[PDB]
Amino acid sequence: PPLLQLPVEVKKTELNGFWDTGAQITCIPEAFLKEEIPIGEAQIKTLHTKLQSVYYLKFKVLGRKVEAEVTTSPFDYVIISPSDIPWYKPQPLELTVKLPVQDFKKELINKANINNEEKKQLAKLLDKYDVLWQQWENQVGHRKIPPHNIATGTVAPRPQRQYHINTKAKPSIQQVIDDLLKQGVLIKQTSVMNTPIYPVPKPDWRMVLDYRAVNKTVPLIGAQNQHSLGILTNLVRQKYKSTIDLSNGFWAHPITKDSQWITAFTWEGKQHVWTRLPQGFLNSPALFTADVVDLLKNIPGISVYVDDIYFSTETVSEHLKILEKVFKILLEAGYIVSLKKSALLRYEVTFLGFSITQTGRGLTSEFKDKIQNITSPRTLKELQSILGLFNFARNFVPNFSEIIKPLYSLISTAEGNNIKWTSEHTRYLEEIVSALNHAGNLEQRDNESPLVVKLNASPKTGYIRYYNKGGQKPIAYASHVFTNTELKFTPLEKLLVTMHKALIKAIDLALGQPIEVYSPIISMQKLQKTPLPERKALSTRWITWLSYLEDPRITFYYDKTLPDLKNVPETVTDKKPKMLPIIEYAAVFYTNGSAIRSPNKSHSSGMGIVHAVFELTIEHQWSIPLGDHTAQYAEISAVEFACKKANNISGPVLIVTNSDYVARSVNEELPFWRSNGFVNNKKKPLKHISKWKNISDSLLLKRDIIIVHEPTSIHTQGNNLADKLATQGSYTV
RNA sequence: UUCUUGUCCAGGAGAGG
DNA sequence: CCTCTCCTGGACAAG
């Protein structure tokens, strides 16, 4: 049914003709009828339908003489009406492997979310446009446009040598190469330029065209390319929605004969060039996208990314009429639709890697399933893949840059191909995964309301929120942690750094609407002449913010409702520090004490600490008197002594007492004691407060110190040793 | 980095306090 | 010992 392309010769020149069932009269390029007398003028139905001069011409079609009425055309190919050659019978195209298009049709009607009476109407619609759907693997369409001149550079790239590639990919690529040859997309032709080719393994391979040398010479097309975050916010969220997929839209757009030389590549000795734009060329995405947005530009409320088309309506009848209208445009143009990659009439549909629901835009269930079954990384490539996968939800949850900063910092400390992974990093990953599992759907931007941003900043991170004026649910989130440069900023300066990032994404989300900024800033006019001593940044950062005030469309306010995060300190950590194996600690400290009754005196106490590095080795040992002091005082001074010695050694260190009280109190209350001025439950000064202060500050200077006490074990041997030393100290008095 | 969108890395070259 | 600028060469995700 998708017919075939047949050759045609006009004025003793070979050309390519397409048998068009919809064309009433045949058309020929303009450069061929310039020296001929027109019969007259007739209305010709195009997509732009103004009359052109009609002619009468004779030419050879497949070696057969024909005579017919013709009109001018800007194309480089010939269009042939079926009426003019009634002798010709259409021959269906033959490729390598056929698609279960009938099965694709049934999958789309079954997973369609309508009543049975509406399914019958849509089923007849799908059967009617059977020519539109891709019925063969690697099938390509024929877009009715003037070919693209892509060799628009003023200099040529150097030919590139081609290396050998894997043998198993070679026959998998040969199946698609032959398919593109039989459709006329690839022709075996030599050229001055040649580009390398390498294969990427498919999950079942694939072919990539390294076009770096070519792209370094071709200028950017004037058509800008859409941003994924912008089209997802600016789309309409109706109940009945559908997404259509154009299969190989790149290979449906022809290119001019004078530009095909640049698309050459050597495969198995022979050299091939492209009749249509290839994937990997610089401007090929922009021309495809710009073309498809132009056809459905008249159709309202419809987003479109590369090879996917999305729209939505509230009436199922309205949705059915749009599909017919869209299918007509795609068939008249020359595109083909992949049914296995498209979804129609679904309350919930996955568009651009995200699920569009009634509730709002949301993550894919398959994406959430992929998150949970993620192992801990082992190499740099593994970690990079994990980070890139996780990034999809940066706009979905605030504090994303906060919670992911350590992993991004771990990639910088990583050398070679191995990254230093710890048991604290895996707990971070499970926390990341759980936070992503507890995600929430966002709202969609509307063109009527002016965009409003709400931003607030802690001394460590700035937080951004995107809403609509009077809206409840936010459109997106944004977070940015301050760098080492930005952390030394004044809090006023940190708020402006946060506003900077908010305004770039706001411009992408503005949609030609005024922007309102809610922030803890009290005024902006006074910020223009801020005195220099209050500035901790340089002139450059201050100039960009001053430049933002000159924009009248945006306006700023002071939202006192915002939480005060500028002066709040970090809360007490409740996570228990995981312990490394005893061979991984730089040194291990065992501390002990003693109390002995003494002759009008209470005690004769002593201290006992040992320096041990790991087998186990006694590096240093200490035994000293303390005099008239309680047993608990000797223990606290013992673990204090080890904290100072631990401060001297680099790397994680482990300290153990034989007193559960000191170890338990240190882990459970030393942070609270640090803040409340070292007072007890009765709001009274602790005993040994000066000793607690020294332990406190030694714990802050070296935060990888782990205090714990467990006391027959491995630590029992040295606990007994340190206990022996405490007695000897006590006696020397 | 085939290319698009997005988040990052490194190298080099310099200039400023 | 910082900070900022602009050029080049790269990494990952899924389209």
Author numbering: 4 to 51, 53 to 208, 211 to 605, 608 to 622, 625 to 721, 728 to 749
Sentences from the paper on this structure:
The first comprised the full-length PR-RT protein and an RNA/DNA hybrid with 15 bp and overhangs in the RNA strand (a 2-nucleotide [nt] overhang at the 5′ terminus and a 1-nt overhang at the 3′ end [substrate 1]). The sequence of this substrate corresponded to the PPT sequence with the preferred RNase H cut site that was located 13 nt from the recessed 3′ end of the primer. In the structure of full-length PR-RT, the electron density was observed for all four domains: PR, POL, connection, and RNase H. The POL-connection part forms a globular core of the enzyme that is very similar to the p66 subunit of HIV-1 RT and XMRV RT. However, in the present MFV PR-RT structure, the RH domain is well defined because of its stabilization by crystal contacts. In the structure, we observed the electron density for 17 nt of the RNA strand and 15 nt of the DNA strand of the hybrid substrate. It is bound by the POL-connection fragment of MFV PR-RT in a manner that is similar to those of other RTs (HIV-1, XMRV, and Ty3), with the 3′ recessed end of the nucleic acid duplex located at the active site of the POL domain. For the full-length protein, contacts are formed between the POL domain and nt +2 to −6 of the RNA/DNA hybrid. We note, however, that the 3′ end of the DNA in our structure is slightly displaced from the active site, most likely because of the unusual placement of the base of RNA nt +2 in the grove of the hybrid. The fragment of the substrate that comprises nt −8 to −11 interacts with the RH domain of the symmetry-related molecule. Contacts of the RH domain with this part of the substrate result from crystal packing, and such positioning of this domain cannot be accommodated in a single molecule of MFV PR-RT.
